[PDB]
Design a protein around this ligand. Structure first.
Ligand SMILES: Cc1ccc2c(c1)sc(-c1ccc(N(C)C)cc1)[n+]2C
Ligand SMILES: Cc1ccc2c(c1)sc(-c1ccc(N(C)C)cc1)[n+]2C
Ligand SMILES: Cc1ccc2c(c1)sc(-c1ccc(N(C)C)cc1)[n+]2C
Ligand SMILES: Cc1ccc2c(c1)sc(-c1ccc(N(C)C)cc1)[n+]2C
Ligand SMILES: Cc1ccc2c(c1)sc(-c1ccc(N(C)C)cc1)[n+]2C
Ligand SMILES: Cc1ccc2c(c1)sc(-c1ccc(N(C)C)cc1)[n+]2C
Ligand SMILES: Cc1ccc2c(c1)sc(-c1ccc(N(C)C)cc1)[n+]2C
Ligand SMILES: Cc1ccc2c(c1)sc(-c1ccc(N(C)C)cc1)[n+]2C
Lengths: 61, 61, 61, 61, 61, 61, 61, 61
């Protein structure tokens, strides 16, 4: 009955340095799912599913 | 009955430096799903599904 | 009845330095799922499934 | 009834330096699931399944 | 007699990302010389002295 | 008599990522010379002295 | 008489990632010379002295 | 008479990752010379003295 939060962190990203030097980056997709290059991502979910970088081929029900 | 939040963080991104030097970046998609290049993203969901970089091939019900 | 959080961390990423030098990066997908290059990702889920870099081939029910 | 958290850490990644020099990185997927290159990832799940880098071939029910 | 320069670089700085988070930065100088915080500086000198971040206490001739 | 330069580099800095988190940075100088924090600096000198981060106490001739 | 330079490098710095987390950084100088924190520095000198991070106490001639 | 340089390197630094976590860094100088923290430095000198991190107490001629 006396919750006291103070300077708390939940789902936090900080202090990120990235260098990426590429000559050729190619993605070829035929009927599927491709996720590429996810950087410095943060989230908080309450009462639900939390997905960040999810690829599902297909759902053929 | 006495929740006291103070300087709390939930789903936070800060301090991000990114350099990307590419000569050729190509994406070719035929009937699928492609997600590429997600940087410095933050969210908070209450009572729901929270997705950031999600690719689903297809839903053929 | 007297929860007192103070400077706590849950699902936190900080202080990350990355260099990536490639000449050719290629992804070829035919009806599947490919996830590539997930860096500096943090999340917190309450009452749900938490996935970060998940690839599912397909769901043929 | 008197939980007192102080400077605690749960699912935390910090102080990570990575260099990756490649001439050719290729992924070829035909109807499966491929996950590649997951770095500096942290999460905390309460009352749910927590997966980071999971690849499932397919679910044919 | 046939100098042919092509895409040459001399005194060049490029692709620099910097983050600096400080709570207190102080400089106290009494009769001296202080240089602080020189970032991403480039020069080319022909037939002369080239100095970038030089501090000389004093010249009492 | 047929100098042919092509894509040459002399005094070059590139691809630099820096993070600096400090609580207190102090410099106290009394009659001297202090140089601090020189990052990503490049120069080319022809027929002269080339100094980057030089501190001389004093010159009492 | 047929110098042919091609993709040559002289005094070059590239691909540098640095993280520095300090609580207290102090410099106290009384009549001397202090150099601190020189990162990712490159130079080329022709027909002269080349110094990068040089500290001289004093020159009392 | 037919010098042919090709993809040569002279005084080159590349691919450097550094993390430094300190609680207290102090320098106290009284009439001397202190050099501290030189990282990822490259130079090329022709017909001259090349010094990188040199500290001289004093020159009392
Ligand atoms: C910081 C924080 C976050 C959530 C949170 C609390 C504190 S306390 C609490 C709670 C949940 C269920 C019940 N009952 C049904 C008896 C009573 C309290 N929640 C859900
Ligand atoms: C900061 C914060 C946010 C939400 C929050 C609390 C604190 S505490 C609380 C709560 C949830 C359910 C119930 N019952 C059904 C007994 C009673 C209280 N919520 C929903
Ligand atoms: C920081 C924090 C977050 C959540 C949290 C607590 C502390 S304590 C608590 C709780 C859960 C279930 C029940 N009952 C059903 C007896 C009573 C209390 N929750 C849910
Ligand atoms: C830090 C922290 C996190 C969770 C947490 C506590 C403290 S204390 C607690 C709890 C769980 C169940 C019950 N009952 C049903 C008697 C009472 C308390 N939880 C769930
Ligand atoms: C790219 C470039 C820049 C300058 C440069 C050359 C090429 S070639 C040259 C030269 C210097 C001195 C003399 N003599 C006194 C015989 C003859 C030529 N300079 C001065
Ligand atoms: C790329 C480059 C840079 C400088 C440079 C050359 C090529 S070639 C040259 C030279 C210097 C002296 C003389 N004499 C006095 C015979 C003739 C040529 N310099 C000075
Ligand atoms: C790339 C490069 C840069 C400079 C350079 C050469 C090649 S070749 C050369 C030279 C120096 C001295 C003399 N004489 C006095 C006979 C003749 C040639 N320089 C000065
Ligand atoms: C790559 C490179 C760099 C320097 C360089 C050469 C090639 S070739 C050369 C040279 C020096 C002296 C003389 N004489 C006085 C006969 C002739 C040539 N240098 C000085």
């Amino acid at each position: 009955v006396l919750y006291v939060g103070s300077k708390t962190k939940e789902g936090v990203v900080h202090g990120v340095a990235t260098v990426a030097e590429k000559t050729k980056e190619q993605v070829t997709n035929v009927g599927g799912a491709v996720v590429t290059g996810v950087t410095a991502v943060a989230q908080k979910t309450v009462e639900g599913a939390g997905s960040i970088a999810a690829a599902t081929g297909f759902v053929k029900k």
